[PDB]
């Protein structure tokens, strides 16, 4: 029934505070109500301290707020091996204390930021220790993969080729949201050259609400978390669907709002709206879980999708006859009281595996090689209990992920 969450790394905690804000906001639970169902992990105290100081302060137990006062380091090795090791036992102890208290759970919605130190390296072993202690559950990791050109950390690819290889054999379905291809939505589909990080976090805060919050909630076409990985992963690699939202309209500028189903569904497959710089450049969709919420007739959907199945310029995979998980919830979306989000009476939070990430992975892998070809910042991980092995051998790993996402499509 339930799904724990584990918000790891500063960014996995900033998005965490925002997904966690949107929750109580659509459930009538003000600053001090019930109790959360998650934990927070960082090797930098000052950030989890923003959840201990700022808004949502007393909505958490100081027990679900793990910190290592020590050092974050923007390097996988340190954050996986060396330092992030010391904290793991204590972290697990919460996702084993919180996992016992509940009633017949389904999994853990992990929140991490791929190209970090605590968001890469620690979660790699956290998800590692989960797939063994609870191999009988869902492991849906919600990642914020590296921006395609607007990366931050100089090493980013070293951290994100190492979170992918170690988590790959451990996740069930990895949601992805690209930080830059969101800013294009903030510029083009909302009109603001002032996107604070606090806004991208409202937007993932929104798509994510559609995943757990409203779908674990009753509706005309409910969709358990197990239903995702079943209807969404064609193969055992921890396959990485993309998150997309539909009524991303501005709460000030334009106002057509009343954009019946037939429109909001079409607004998902246009590449300029999908929180990911994986524009469907060739990438065949292979399975899509269209989560709807608000006032939606099942015939409007079983017609608004039928039109799309016959657009052909949307080319689904060959071995997939029908790859359209319709999920219908009742309660409309619930926008922030005065952020910037429109507030419509319906939305489409479609997510899907696409052969498109054959690109995104290739462009992120090629990055890694250019520095590893010179060793670059390698002495920063080797001095932290890693080897020529874990780099070269996690590089060979993602090489068979460039081939997997090629072979599962492009061919018939």
């Amino acid at each position: 029934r339930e799904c724990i969450s584990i918000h790891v790394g500063q960014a996995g905690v900033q998005i965490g505070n925002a997904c966690w804000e949107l929750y109580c906001l659509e459930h009538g639970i003000q600053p001090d109500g019930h109790v959360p169902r998650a934990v927070f992990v960082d090797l930098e105290p000052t950030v989890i301290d923003e959840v201990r100081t700022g808004t949502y302060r007393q909505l958490f137990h100081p027990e679900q707020l793990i910190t290592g006062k020590e050092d974050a380091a923007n390097n996988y090795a340190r954050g996986h091996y060396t330092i992030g090791k010391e904290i793991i036992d204590l972290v697990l102890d919460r996702i084993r204390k919180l996992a016992d208290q509940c009633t017949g759970l389904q999994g853990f919605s992990v929140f991490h930021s791929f190209g970090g130190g605590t968001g890469s390296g620690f979660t790699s072993l956290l998800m590692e220790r989960l797939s063994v202690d609870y191999g009988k559950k869902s492991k849906l990791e919600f990642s914020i993969y590296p921006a395609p050109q607007v990366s931050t950390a100089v090493v980013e690819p070293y951290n994100s080729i190492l979170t992918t290889h170690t988590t790959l054999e451990h996740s069930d379905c990895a949601f992805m949201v690209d930080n830059e291809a969101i800013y294009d939505i903030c510029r083009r589909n909302l009109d603001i050259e002032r996107p604070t990080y606090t806004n991208l976090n409202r937007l993932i805060g929104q798509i994510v609400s559609s995943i757990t919050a409203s779908l674990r909630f009753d509706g005309a076409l409910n969709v358990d978390l197990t239903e995702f990985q079943t209807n969404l992963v064609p193969y055992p690699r921890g396959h990485f669907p993309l998150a997309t939202y539909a009524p991303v309209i501005s709460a000030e500028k334009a106002y057509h709002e009343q954009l019946s189903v037939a429109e909001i569904t079409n607004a998902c497959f246009e590449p300029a709206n999908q929180m990911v710089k994986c524009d469907p450049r060739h990438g065949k969709y292979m399975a899509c879980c269209l989560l709807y919420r608000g006032d939606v007739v099942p015939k409007d959907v079983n017609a608004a999708i039928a039109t799309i199945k016959t657009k052909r310029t949307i080319q689904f995979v060959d071995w997939c006859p029908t790859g359209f998980k319709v999920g219908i919830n009742y309660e409309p979306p619930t926008v922030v009281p005065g952020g910037d989000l429109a507030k419509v009476q319906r939305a489409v939070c479609m997510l899907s595996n696409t052969t498109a990430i054959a690109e995104a992975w290739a462009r992120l892998d090629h990055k890694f090689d250019l520095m590893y070809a010179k060793r670059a910042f390698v002495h920063w991980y080797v001095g932290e209990g890693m080897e020529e092995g874990e780099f070269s051998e996690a590089r060979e790993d993602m090489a068979a992920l460039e081939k997997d996402y090629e072979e599962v499509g492009v061919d018939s």
Partner: protein, 328 residues
């Protein structure tokens, strides 16, 4: 070229043999070895020579060290690069194996014989040293030294002063330096107590030839030879958080990285030149003197057939072959 590489597989260990789970590499023929037998990765690897598990110390002696001795006698400085998995057993029986004929024993005798013949015909004099790199401090094994200070001569070929060499009387005198040395290094108390595996042992022999046939007043040819036992790589577990390993593992991890980066850069400097940063480690700077130049070199990797060696022997074959395979 000058570089030639041979990898000698060592028999599976009594316990490894009796279990038998998927073999790390499955040696196909003598030279070609397949990695990850069924599919799986199924990676063929070629080497310049390769010796099978049946090939003992005596066969590797004759192969590896014969082009070494000839070049060493010629006055070309030689080196042997050891490798092996991190797990002992293959490396344990590869080096210091008294029972095994010893690549080092038969090559020490091989040189020792050839040295006596060059001395009778010509005036040849030699000397030897034995040092380790533990904690990135050079220790002499012969004398209890402290941290050898660095100077540079007129050539400025970087010298750790305070090294003592004695002239090789017999192989027996060398055996006393090997014994003194091998007990001078500590075991590593982490895991099972290994030898000084984690510390790099260096053996040095210096040949000095004057010709009786040539005029007394001539150039002298000297070569340096070195044999290096290296550590294995450390995992998270074999590392550990512990402060006791902590210093040692930091010394090894930077020595392995800077050394192996200098080996990759060494292969690039078989094209290149001053590029290769000798300076990145103390010993890697002395390794320029031996391995740099157009000197005849060989690498001997160890490989075990055990499944335990899956990771370690694959990483060592990967790293050894990576420097060969990269050419621009």
């Amino acid at each position: 070229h000058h570089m030639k590489v041979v990898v000698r597989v060592r028999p599976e260990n009594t316990k490894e043999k009796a279990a038998g789970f998927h073999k790390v590499v499955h040696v196909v023929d003598k030279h070609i070895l397949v990695f990850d037998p069924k599919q799986n990765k199924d990676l063929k690897f070629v080497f310049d020579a390769v010796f099978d598990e049946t090939s003992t110390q005596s066969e590797v002696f004759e192969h590896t060290t014969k082009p070494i001795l000839r070049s060493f006698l010629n006055g070309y400085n030689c080196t042997v690069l050891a490798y092996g998995a991190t797990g002992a057993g293959k490396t344990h029986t590869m080096l210091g194996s008294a029972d095994e004929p010893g690549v080092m024993y038969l090559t020490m005798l091989h040189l020792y014989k050839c040295m006596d013949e060059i001395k009778e015909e010509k005036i040849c004099s030699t000397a030897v040293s034995y040092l380790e790199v533990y904690n990135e401090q050079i220790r002499d094994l012969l004398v209890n030294s402290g941290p050898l200070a660095v100077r540079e001569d007129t050539q400025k070929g970087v010298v750790v002063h305070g090294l003592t060499l004695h002239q090789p009387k017999s192989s027996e005198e060398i055996l006393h330096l090997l014994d003194n040395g091998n007990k001078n290094r500590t075991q590593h108390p982490t895991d099972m107590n290994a030898t000084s595996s984690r510390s790099h042992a260096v053996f040095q022999i210096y040949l000095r030839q004057q010709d009786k046939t040539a005029s007394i007043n001539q150039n002298v040819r000297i070569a340096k030879m070195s044999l290096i036992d290296l550590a294995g790589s450390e995992r998270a577990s074999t590392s550990g958080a512990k402060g006791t390993r902590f210093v040692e593992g930091t010394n090894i991890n930077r020595s392995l990285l800077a050394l192996g980066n200098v080996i990759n850069a060494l292969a690039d400097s078989k094209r290149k030149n001053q590029h290769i940063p000798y300076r990145n480690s103390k010993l890697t700077r002395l390794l320029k003197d031996s391995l740099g130049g157009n000197c005849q070199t060989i690498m001997i990797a160890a490989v075990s057939p055990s499944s335990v060696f899956y990771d370690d022997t694959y990483n060592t074959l990967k790293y050894a072959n990576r420097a060969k395979d990269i050419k621009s």
